[PDB]
């Protein structure tokens, strides 16, 4: 059974609302998965704005880019789903 | 000829392979070695067959030696059991 701490789900969920409030124009959906990780889904135009806010904001410094990858779901109209993981 | 045929027809060009060479063929056919084995007589209607081992043999299946007409044969060892 998982030892998932609930503190994290909440803390991060709260950041997800923070990011969604700070950037309403580009973020289409924010969700904390049950693996306790966060995912902010942004319109493609928000790629440089959203990542700059995270790289340079005192309450959310996300200095390193862990990876950039693109899942290809052929069904979706916009097949590629570029995903940027930041630390 | 292997226990499963395979013998090349004289005309088969697939015979060059063995020239200056030979053919890997196992002389110990299991069709016969298993026939060179005593039908395992038993008292009970049904019998087990762990493959002569626990965890070192084959999955354990119970065979119904219920009809002398037929010696049950565990599908794994090919061992005939004589009621």
């Amino acid at each position: 059974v998982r030892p998932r701490s609930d503190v994290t789900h909440k803390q991060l969920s709260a950041f997800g609302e923070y990011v969604a409030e700070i950037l309403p124009k580009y973020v289409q959906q924010v969700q904390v998965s049950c693996l306790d990780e966060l995912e902010i889904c942004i319109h493609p135009d928000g790629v440089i704005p959203t990542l700059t806010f995270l790289r340079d904001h005192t309450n959310a410094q996300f200095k390193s880019l862990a990876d950039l990858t693109a899942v290809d779901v052929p069904t979706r109209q916009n097949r590629f789903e570029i995903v940027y993981n930041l630390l | 000829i292997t226990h499963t045929g395979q013998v090349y027809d004289e005309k088969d060009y697939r015979r060059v392979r063995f020239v200056d060479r030979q053919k890997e063929v196992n002389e110990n056919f299991a069709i016969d070695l298993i026939a060179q084995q005593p039908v395992n007589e038993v008292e009970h209607r049904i019998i087990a067959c762990d493959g002569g081992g626990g965890a070192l043999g084959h999955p354990k299946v119970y065979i119904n030696l219920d009809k002398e007409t037929k010696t049950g044969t565990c599908g794994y060892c090919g061992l005939q059991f004589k009621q």
């Binding site: 052929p74 069904t75 979706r76 109209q77 | 392979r17």
Partner: protein, 78 residues
């Protein structure tokens, strides 16, 4: 009787030559697009991909079992 493998639309390609390797007797092939089975979620999204890539399609409508009424007692009538 599991119906979980009959729910998503697949786009498989034509079946070309599957022949025998002379040396070991294995099945060999020259169709690069042989093991290809793209999986979509609707007729609309599969026709789109095929048209997108320039392949010819042969859509086949879905065949869901119709509802067949079943009752336990019925087999007790006379």
């Amino acid at each position: 009787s599991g119906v979980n493998n009959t729910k998503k639309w697949k786009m498989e390609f034509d079946t070309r030559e599957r022949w025998e390797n002379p040396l070991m007797g294995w099945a060999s092939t020259a169709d690069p697009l042989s093991n290809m089975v793209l999986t979509f979620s609707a007729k609309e999204d599969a026709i789109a991909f095929a048209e997108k890539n320039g392949w010819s399609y042969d859509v086949e409508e879905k065949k869901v079992p119709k509802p067949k009424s079943k009752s336990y007692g019925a087999n007790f009538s006379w």
